[PDB]
C-alpha cells in the first residue's frame, strides 16, 4: 500500500505534459515533501516500484531535451534531497552532473538559479557523510565551479556581461557557501573570483552600472571568505593583510574626500596624510588588480569610502577559519578621523576651517556627503560591538564621543538618528551602568531627541517609523543601564511621561524597578498605577504589583 501522495505524483508525472509540468510543480513539491517514508526507505512492494519509477522519471526529465522538464527535474531533485535523507543523497550521482549540465546548456535564468540552489544544498548535505564528499562532491565540484565562473566571467573588455547581476549574486552566494567547506578543491579558482568580484565591492557613480545591494554584500562576503583557500594555513595572514589594506584604502580615499577640510586629526598608528593637489576634481583609483576600479568626483569618492566602510563591516559580519589579529587600534583611529570632520549648523561654514582653493560647489557636495560616511562609520561600530561583545568595553568611551558628535552634527537626518539610537542601545547595554556624570550629561540630547521622536510617533507632541522603533527599543535602556543619580529630574520626568504616553510596557517596568534619587532625598512617585491600569493581566506587572507595593 503506497502513499496516496506517491500515487498522485506518479500519475500526474505520467499524464501531465512536460510543457505544463512547471505549472504543476507547486503541488508536486508538496506531495514529495509529504512522501517522507518510501523515499527514505533503502533498497517487491508497490512503494518500491513507484519510488523507482519516480526516480527514473526524474532522471528522464533531467536528461531530456525539454527545458520545462529540466526545471521540473530541478524542483523534484531539491524536494527529494530535502525529504529522502541519505538514500536520496547516495542515489544522486547522475543528478549532480545533470544539474551542472542545466547550468551549462542555454536554459533560462530561473532554472539556472534553482539548479545552483539545489547543488549548493547537495554539497552542504554531503558534509555530514565523510565518504560521499570523496566519491561524489570532490570530482563533480570543479566542473560546477568552472561553469559558474564561465557564467559570471566577463566575455570581453568591449562587451557587457551576459548574465544579470542578480544571477551573479546567486553565483557569489553559492561560492560563499562552498568555500568554507571545500577550500582545497576550489583553491585554484580563487584567482578568477577575485577578478570577477572586483567591480562589485565598492561601486561608485562613475562605474555607470547599478550594482545590486545583495550582490555587493555577497561579493564582500566571498572575497573575505576566500582566505580559507590560502595554502600552508595562510588564512590569518591573508585576512590581516587584506583588512589592513582596506584600512589603508579608506585613508587614501578619505584624503581625496577631505582635501577641502583642514584636519586637526593625528594618528596613533602613525599614518600621515599625503598632500593632495588643489587643482582639478578629486580623483582616486587605478586599473591595477589589487586596487579597486577608478572613480572620479568628490561624491563618487564618498560612495567609495562608504563601500569600503561597509566592506570593513562585512569583515566583522563574516567568520574566520583561524584566530586572526584584528587591528582595533587602526579601526578606531580611522573612525576617529572620519568622525572628527562634521557638518556645521546654519552659518557655521565660516567657523569650520576650509581650504581656500576649494570651490563652494565642491564644499557643498562635501557637506552633503559627510552624513552617509558618518552613518557607515556608526554601522561599522555596531558590527564591532556585536562581534566583540564585552571586548569593546576598552573602546566604549571613544564610540560614545563619536556617536554624540555625529548625532549633534546631524540631528535632522532620521537615518542618522535611528543608527545613533541602535548604537546607543548596544553601548549602554555593554558598559552603561558605570558611565560618569560628564558622559551622562553629554548623552542628554540623545535622550531628548529619542523622547521627542517617540512622542511625535505616538501623536502626543504620525505612524510607525524605523526611528520610532529604534527609540522605543532604546527607551527601557535609559532606566535599566544608566545612572539614575546623574540624571536631572526633568530628564527622568520626560522619560516617565514618554513611557506612559507611548504605553511602553518594558520601559514602564524598568521605571518602576528603578526609582529616581534626587539630592534632597524625597521619594518621587512611581508610574505603577498607569502600568497596572494599562496592562493589568501581564505576569511581570503582577509581580511588580505584589512586590513593590509591599
Amino acid at each position: 500500500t503506497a502513499p496516496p501522495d506517491l500515487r498522485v505524483v506518479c500519475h500526474r508525472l505520467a499524464s501531465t505534459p512536460v510543457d505544463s509540468l512547471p505549472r504543476l510543480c507547486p503541488l508536486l513539491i508538496n506531495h514529495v515533501l509529504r512522501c517522507g517514508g518510501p523515499l527514505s526507505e533503502p533498497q517487491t512492494s508497490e512503494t518500491a516500484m513507484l519510488v523507482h519509477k519516480f526516480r527514473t522519471h526524474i532522471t528522464s526529465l533531467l536528461t531530456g531535451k525539454s527545458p520545462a522538464g529540466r526545471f521540473t527535474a530541478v524542483c523534484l531533485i531539491k524536494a527529494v534531497i530535502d525529504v529522502g535523507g541519505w538514500e536520496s543523497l547516495r542515489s544522486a550521482e547522475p543528478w549532480i552532473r545533470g544539474l551542472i549540465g542545466v547550468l551549462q546548456k542555454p536554459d533560462p535564468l530561473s532554472s539556472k538559479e534553482l539548479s545552483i540552489v539545489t547543488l549548493t544544498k547537495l554539497y552542504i548535505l554531503l558534509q555530514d557523510y565523510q565518504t560521499l564528499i570523496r566519491e561524489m562532491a570532490t570530482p563533480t565540484l570543479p566542473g560546477y565551479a568552472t561553469a559558474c565562473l564561465q557564467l559570471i566571467k566577463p566575455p570581453a573588455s568591449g562587451r557587457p556581461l551576459k548574465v544579470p547581476l542578480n544571477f551573479v549574486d546567486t553565483v557569489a552566494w553559492s561560492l560563499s557557501k562552498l568555500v568554507v567547506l571545500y577550500s582545497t578543491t576550489m583553491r585554484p579558482f580563487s584567482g578568477q573570483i577575485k577578478s570577477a568580484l572586483r567591480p562589485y565591492i565598492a561601486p561608485t557613480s562613475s562605474d555607470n552600472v547599478v550594482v545590486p545591494q545583495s550582490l555587493k554584500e555577497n561579493s564582500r562576503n566571498l572575497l573575505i571568505l576566500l582566505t580559507y583557500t590560502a595554502p600552508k594555513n595562510g588564512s590569518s595572514d591573508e585576512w590581516v593583510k587584506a583588512i589592513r589594506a582596506t584600512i589603508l584604502d579608506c585613508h587614501t580615499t578619505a584624503d581625496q574626500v577631505f582635501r577641502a577640510v583642514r584636519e586637526s586629526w593625528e594618528s596613533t598608528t602613525g599614518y600621515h596624510i599625503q598632500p593632495v593637489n588643489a587643482t582639478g576634481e578629486p580623483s582616486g583609483g587605478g586599473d591595477s588588480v589589487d586596487e579597486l576600479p577608478p572613480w572620479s568626483g568628490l561624491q563618487a569618492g564618498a560612495e567609495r569610502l562608504t563601500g569600503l566602510l561597509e566592506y570593513l563591516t562585512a569583515y566583522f559580519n563574516n567568520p574566520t577559519r583561524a584566530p586572526v589579529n584584528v587591528p582595533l587600534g587602526e579601526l578606531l583611529d580611522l573612525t576617529t578621523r572620519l568622525t572628527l570632520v562634521i557638518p556645521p549648523s546654519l552659518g557655521a561654514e565660516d567657523s569650520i576651517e576650509t581650504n581656500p582653493a576649494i570651490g563652494r560647489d565642491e564644499k557643498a557636495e562635501l557637506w552633503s556627503a559627510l552624513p552617509d560616511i558618518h552613518h557607515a562609520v556608526l554601522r561599522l561600530h555596531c558590527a564591532i560591538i556585536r562581534r566583540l561583545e564585552a571586548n569593546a568595553i576598552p573602546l566604549a568611551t571613544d564610540i560614545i564621543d563619536q556617536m554624540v558628535r555625529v548625532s549633534t552634527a546631524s540631528k535632522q537626518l532620521p537615518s542618522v538618528r535611528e543608527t545613533a539610537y541602535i548604537l546607543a542601545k548596544e553601548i549602554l547595554l555593554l558598559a552603561g551602568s558605570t558611565l560618569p556624570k560628564l558622559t551622562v550629561d553629554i548623552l542628554i540630547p540623545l535622550i531628548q531627541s529619542s523622547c521627542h521622536d517617540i512622542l511625535t510617533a505616538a501623536g502626543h507632541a504620525s505612524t510607525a517609523s524605523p526611528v520610532s522603533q529604534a527609540a522605543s527599543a532604546l527607551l527601557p535602556t535609559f532606566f535599566t543601564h544608566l545612572p539614575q543619580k546623574h540624571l536631572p529630574p526633568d530628564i527622568r520626568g520626560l522619560l516617565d511621561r514618554t513611557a506612559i504616553l507611548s504605553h511602553n510596557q518594558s520601559a514602564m517596568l524598568a521605571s518602576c524597578l528603578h526609582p529616581y534619587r534626587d539630592s534632597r532625598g524625597r521619594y518621587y512617585p512611581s508610574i505603577l498605577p498607569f502600568l497596572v491600569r494599562r496592562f493589568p493581566r501581564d505576569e511581570s506587572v503582577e509581580v511588580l504589583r505584589s512586590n513593590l507595593v509591599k
Binding site: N317, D398, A431
Partner: protein, 395 residues
C-alpha cells in the same frame, strides 16, 4: 543527555603514599552527574585557594609560592602557557576573557588574554588581597586590611588611560581580614548586593553600588568559604568549627526584603545545617551545582563531600584525591553561544603596539540573504517557486 562537570585543583605534597594516585597531577576534571568519573587530568600544578579559573577553552591556575600562572587548554588537553606575573598571586578569577589577579602587595592586574594587555592598579590595599569577585561592570576586592574596594571595570580598562586608577567606594565596617566575597548576578542599582565573610565571625550583605550595609550575620566561627545559591535565596557558608551553615534571606524571619528588620540589627546564626568529622576537616572550598540542590565541599585532608540539601544532612564522600583539594569549580552543562573563540592566548607584554584583538570568528549567521530562505526551507518557498515559474514562462 545533560552531564554536569566540575574541575578540581589540589595543592601541596601528597599526604599518603599511594602509587595509584599520581603525585604530579594537580588538576582533575570530573563528572558529578550521572555518577563520579574522572574525565581528564592536568599536570604539575600546586594551586592554592581562589587561584583557579575555568572557561570553556582554558583553565587558569595560579601557582603557590611562584609568581606564575599555568594555562591549560581544555580543547587540546595540554599545558599551553607558562605566564609570569610581576608580583605574587594570592587570588585569581576570570570575567569574560579578562583575568583579575589580586596580589600580596595589594595590587590588582587586569590581563586581557586575547589582546595581551596588562593593567596594574595602584596598591590601594595596604596588605594582601584575599578575595575578589566580578560582574561585567564591577570588581570587588576584599583584602586583609579589613577593606573591600569597589572598582569600575570600564574605568579600569581603557585605551590610552594614564590616570591612576581609584576605587569608587570602600566598605570598611568589618574589623578583620576579609575571607570571602560573593556577588548577586543582578547589575541593577537597586536590586544588586554582595555578601562578605571576614575573620571577625561576621558576614555583611552590602549594596556595593550605593555603599549601604543591608544585613549583618554573626556565626560561632569565622567563615572560610561562601557561595550563594543560584536563585539568590540562600547563602551556604563553611566555618572553622567544621560546620556548614545555611541562611535563607526570605524565610519566616527574613534577612532581606520588606518584612526584614532594621540594618543596624545583627542576626545571630547558631543552628548548623551540617558538620564534618575532624578526620575529614573543615571545608576549604565550596561550590554549588547548576540546579542548586547539591553542593560540593573540598577539605584539606583530600576528601570531596557531596551535600544533598533536601535529601541527606550528612555528606557523601565522592573520592579522595590524596592532596588538599583547594578548588572546586562547576561547569554549566549547557553550551553557550559566544561570538568569538579563544583558541590561543597572547602573553602579557609591555611594549608600544596598536590595539590588536586575537580570536577566532565563529559562524553566527549575522548576514541574512533571500537565497538562504530557499536553501534552509524544505523544498522551495511558494513565492520563490512562483517567481521562478513566472520568469521561466516569460521570455
Amino acid at each position: 543527555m545533560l552531564t554536569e562537570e566540575f574541575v578540581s585543583a589540589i595543592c601541596g605534597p601528597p599526604l599518603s603514599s599511594n602509587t595509584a594516585i599520581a603525585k604530579d597531577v594537580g588538576i582533575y576534571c570530573h563528572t558529578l552527574s550521572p555518577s563520579y568519573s574522572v574525565k581528564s587530568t592536568f599536570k604539575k600544578s600546586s594551586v592554592p585557594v581562589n587561584c583557579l579559573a575555568v572557561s570553556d577553552t582554558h583553565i587558569f591556575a595560579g601557582q603557590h609560592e611562584k609568581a606564575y600562572v599555568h594555562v591549560y587548554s581544555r580543547l587540546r588537553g595540554n599545558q599551553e602557557a607558562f605566564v609570569a606575573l610581576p608580583e605574587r598571586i594570592r587570588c585569581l578569577i576570570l570575567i569574560g576573557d579578562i583575568l583579575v589577579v589580586g596580589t600580596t602587595e595589594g595590587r590588582l592586574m587586569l590581563w586581557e588574554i586575547c589582546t595581551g594587555r596588562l593593567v596594574s592598579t595602584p596598591a590601594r590595599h595596604v596588605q594582601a588581597v584575599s578575595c575578589v569577585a566580578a560582574t561585567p561592570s564591577h570588581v570587588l576586592t576584599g583584602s586583609d586590611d579589613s577593606d573591600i574596594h569597589v572598582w569600575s571595570l570600564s574605568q579600569l580598562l581603557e585605551l590610552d588611560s594614564a590616570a591612576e586608577h581609584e576605587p569608587l567606594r570602600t566598605l570598611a565596617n568589618h574589623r578583620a581580614a576579609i575571607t570571602a566575597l560573593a556577588v548577586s548576578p543582578s547589575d541593577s542599582a537597586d536590586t544588586n548586593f554582595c555578601v562578605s565573610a571576614s575573620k571577625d565571625k561576621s558576614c555583611i550583605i552590602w549594596n556595593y553600588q550605593t555603599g549601604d550595609a543591608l544585613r549583618t550575620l554573626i556565626f560561632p566561627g569565622y567563615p572560610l568559604c561562601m557561595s550563594l545559591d543560584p536563585s539568590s535565596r540562600a547563602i551556604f557558608v563553611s566555618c572553622e568549627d567544621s560546620s556548614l551553615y545555611v541562611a535563607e534571606m526570605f524565610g519566616e524571619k527574613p534577612l532581606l526584603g520588606p518584612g526584614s528588620e532594621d540594618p543596624s540589627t545583627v542576626v545571630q546564626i547558631s543552628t548548623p545545617f551540617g558538620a564534618t568529622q575532624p578526620d575529614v576537616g573543615p571545608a576549604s572550598c565550596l561550590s554549588v551545582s547548576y540546579d542548586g540542590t547539591m553542593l560540593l565541599t573540598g577539605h584539606p585532608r583530600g576528601q570531596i563531600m557531596r551535600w544533598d540539601i533536601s535529601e541527606n544532612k550528612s555528606p557523601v564522600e565522592l573520592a579522595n584525591l590524596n592532596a588538599a583539594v583547594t578548588n572546586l569549580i562547576f561547569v554549566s552543562p549547557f553550551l553557550t553561544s559566544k561570538p568569538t573563540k579563544t583558541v590561543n592566548i597572547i602573553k602579557p607584554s609591555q611594549a608600544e603596539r596598536a590595539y590588536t584583538f586575537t580570536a577566532q570568528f565563529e559562524p553566527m549567521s549575522f548576514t541574512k540573504s533571500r537565497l538562504d530562505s530557499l536553501l534552509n526551507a524544505t523544498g522551495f518557498p511558494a513565492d520563490a517557486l512562483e517567481s521562478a515559474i513566472v520568469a521561466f514562462y516569460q521570455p
